[PDB]
Amino acid sequence: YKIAIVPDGKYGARDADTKIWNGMVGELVYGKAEIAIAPLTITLVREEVIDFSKPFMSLGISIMIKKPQKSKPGVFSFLDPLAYEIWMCIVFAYIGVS
């Protein structure tokens, strides 16, 4: 074989206006390459012009989120259960009761 990058850079698709396949699919239907070893998804629209092989990689649509981590609890994180104003007003009430 002889590896040859697709000039267009498109995986495959039908314009739908001039119905000219562009990409790897077009590079096969129109006698340009004999094999497409690429992450070419198997779809009905493409199956009517080429014959895929059995899937070599089963995949799907997943969910990606930003990786989380520890919350490094602050040194003085034991005073959270009460707001700052309560803490300030507890000292005031203490100095006043005494």
Ligand X SMILES: NS(=O)(=O)c1cccc2c1c([N+](=O)[O-])cc1[nH]c(=O)c(=O)[nH]c12
Residues binding ligand X (CB under 6 A):
11-12, 39-41
Q: What Cα–Cα distance (Å) separates residue 3 from each residue in 37, 51, 53, 65?
A: 9, 20, 19, 35
What's the one-letter identity of residue 86?
Answer: I
Nearest to residue 37, comparing CAs of 2, 73, 72, 83? 2
Residues of the shown chain interacting with its own copies in the complex, contacts defined by CB under 8 A = 42, 47, 52, 54-55, 58
State the binding partner of 61 from its own copies, other proteins, ligand X, none, CB within 5 to 8 A by kind.
other proteins
41 is in an annotated binding site: yes
| Residue 39 labelled as part of a binding site | yes
Binding annotation for L-glutamate:
39, 41, 46
